[PDB]
């Protein structure tokens, strides 16, 4: 067990995203005091900030992170990686700080087809934004409420691979599932 400064907090201030330069400083981490930001710039790399592009293999380092005290913001993510694998073991977001003061989970404009946050059992505060993920399915099938701390919590889960094409291309809850929800196709995704 170990709690690490996130992006923004501590020396990781002044730094827009998780990236090559800092990523390694998350090795064997448990809780994250702060926010997680994965921006376009993490994969493009930046000349201005003296920063090499990220080997999207190094996202596998996030695998041990159970708690995020602030918020999660994934705007970019490996075009061929189809899932949010790295965050499989992520169990809880506090939302103690929030994107625009509102959003504790932000999954925008990604190539994901499943979300795959299989261990996520609690968003303590803040709302969920799931936008523009052209091929994402399965998000609807879950009961977000079961993940929530107040009435005041919302889901702006708009503008993805319309639920129709899902059932059409057969992208719905695998049969084994106790109809409460899906994070993806296979049995290891029943909410």
């Amino acid at each position, epitope marked *: 067990k170990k709690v690490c400064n996130g992006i923004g907090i501590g020396e990781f201030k002044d730094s827009l995203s998780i990236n090559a330069t800092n990523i390694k400083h998350f090795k064997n981490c448990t809780s994250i005091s702060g926010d997680l930001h994965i921006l376009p710039v993490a994969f493009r790399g930046d000349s201005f900030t003296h920063t090499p592009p990220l080997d999207p293999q190094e996202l596998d380092i996030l695998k041990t992170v159970k708690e995020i005290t602030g918020f999660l913001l994934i705007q970019a993510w490996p075009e061929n990686r189809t899932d949010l694998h790295a965050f499989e073991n992520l169990e809880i977001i506090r939302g103690r700080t929030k994107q625009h003061g509102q959003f504790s989970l932000a999954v925008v404009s990604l190539n994901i087809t499943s979300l795959g946050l299989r261990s996520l059992k609690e968003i303590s*505060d803040g709302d969920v934004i799931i936008s523009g993920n052209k091929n994402l399915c399965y998000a609807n099938t879950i*009961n*977000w*409420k*079961k*993940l*929530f*701390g*107040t*009435s*005041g*919590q*919302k*889901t*702006k*889960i708009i503008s993805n691979r319309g639920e129709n094409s899902c059932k059409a291309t057969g992208q719905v809850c695998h049969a084994l599932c106790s109809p409460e929800g899906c994070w993806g196709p296979e049995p290891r995704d029943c909410v």
Partner: antibody
Amino acid sequence: QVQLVQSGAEVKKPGASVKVSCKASGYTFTSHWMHWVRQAPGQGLEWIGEFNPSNGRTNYNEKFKSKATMTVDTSTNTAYMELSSLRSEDTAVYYCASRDYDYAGRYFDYWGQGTLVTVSS
Amino acid sequence: DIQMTQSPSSLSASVGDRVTITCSASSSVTYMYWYQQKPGKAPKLLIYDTSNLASGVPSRFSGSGSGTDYTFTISSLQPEDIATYYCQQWSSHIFTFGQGTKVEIKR
């Protein structure tokens, strides 16, 4: 469709308890947070707290943490609200109300007929 | 932790008249609701979020204001509008009600 049928009124001597029931008909129960609002007679509304009948999480208003306790029985679509150390000041209409935000983003809002509780000797 | 000052206590006005009920706030407030309680019936949500007219509610009802200042308005008071109206705020996990405003019709 959506209905909240709350238990009948009752009278209690100070010190006693009371478990006020609320049978939620007409919607998918485990889906909406259940609230309890108190109304002292001839008087305004005071919020006691909310219950997420799906996961069991709870949010009380300062004053009521000690007095009230919120519980649910999903098996029979019914939410309860039990009052401790009953005082002459607990005499009021107890309303339950399913208040929430729709997946649609819109607000969700339905109320019981309220259950009168008289504390007297 | 947030403390509401609703005003006025009572209000008499004629049919067709404009009824405006302010409801002020101590610190700042995320979400603002407006409820209507007709005698002997339970509360009824008319407006949520500040201005979003709940479903079914007629046009004459509205609610505005930003910051710590919220107004509720019945542009054209109808007889069936007799009730006491309450605002509530939701901020940082707890709800808080205003004191009420008895609206009464002059005839």
